[PDB]
Amino acid sequence: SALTQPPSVSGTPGQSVTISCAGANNDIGTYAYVSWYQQLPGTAPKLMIYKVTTRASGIPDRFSGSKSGNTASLTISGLQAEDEADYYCASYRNFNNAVFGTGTKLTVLGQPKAAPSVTLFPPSSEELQANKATLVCLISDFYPGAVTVAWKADSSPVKAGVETTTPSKQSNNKYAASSYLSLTPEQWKSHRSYSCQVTHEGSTVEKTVAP
């Protein structure tokens, strides 16, 4: 089956959060092989705790392992931005089986605001020769992870051929998003320029490329 953990847990950009891992009598109740793993985006899980309370080599003292009945728990005392990751609990199951939980995405939030860095690209000579046109708008280093992209033909808005990604976490903890505008060689040439207008927390960053 599976171990129940809350889908999300948000924490004060200070301290202190607790994550629950609920199982049953014949896994978390009889055996003591409860392990927690921390997985920050793109990488594999990192062993943080095993044997209910045993912290692994290198793990800080602010990580805590606890257990009541068929419910295991991980406590983080004073969170850093390092702690922003998905959390998985595991256990032994008879006979010689393992079980992972649903996972808990930890969100730290008293984090500063970061304005998005926008880079707009004109369709390449090679792409236009290939009878195609793509406008590359690249948004990065922004916090919180929520943006709205407006594409403009001269000064009029564009909705058709717009493809925007969902904001994802970066190595540094901030967010990144990619907006793509599909047009035809004639559409790129028949206008004086196109602009990628990015909105983030009531502020606007506009970038412009011209044929």
Partner: protein, 223 residues
Amino acid sequence: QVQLQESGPGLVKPSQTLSLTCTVSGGSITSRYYAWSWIRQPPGKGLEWIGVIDYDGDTYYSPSLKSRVSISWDTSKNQFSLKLSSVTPADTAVYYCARDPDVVTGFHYDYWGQGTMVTVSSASTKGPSVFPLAPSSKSTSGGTAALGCLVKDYFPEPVTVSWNSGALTSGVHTFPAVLQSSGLYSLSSVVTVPSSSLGTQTYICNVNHKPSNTKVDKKVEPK
């Protein structure tokens, strides 16, 4: 020291089998009290235990997966492999390789593999079209420019972009791929360079798409 690397196809269709192979190095796969296991994490969902093989050689699997899992190993080649049959897209996941440091003490995995993406679809592969993204700094820091590569229309994930055969690592930002309305993926890579290097430095992006066998090197020169 103990280092794990998964081998496997990135695209497989429903009737096919999954011959995923993990290579162990810096430690014997038949020694001490070591257990080797497979774990998959579908796209944005949670970790799932598949099965283990112990240093003595006998295996155990998840009861739900048990029916189509026939884990095997090669002690001479320091390898272990997973075999999945009757595959449907529920088997689309990043498949992991992991070690248990003791077995007479209990479950926990200390060392893991980087993972290999397996995607099940019917869904022919498409190699990416690489386009050059020439520099300008109307939105950048003075002295710094912004160039990159447009890796457009490829199926499926992933693709790896490196600059000058790995010689250029600093200021490199590779963006998460966009899944288009067409069903294909598209991504861009960016390197912030000092504008002074435009009339100097040669910039080549090394795009690699293992599923379709694509390996493209594109020179990004100013226009």
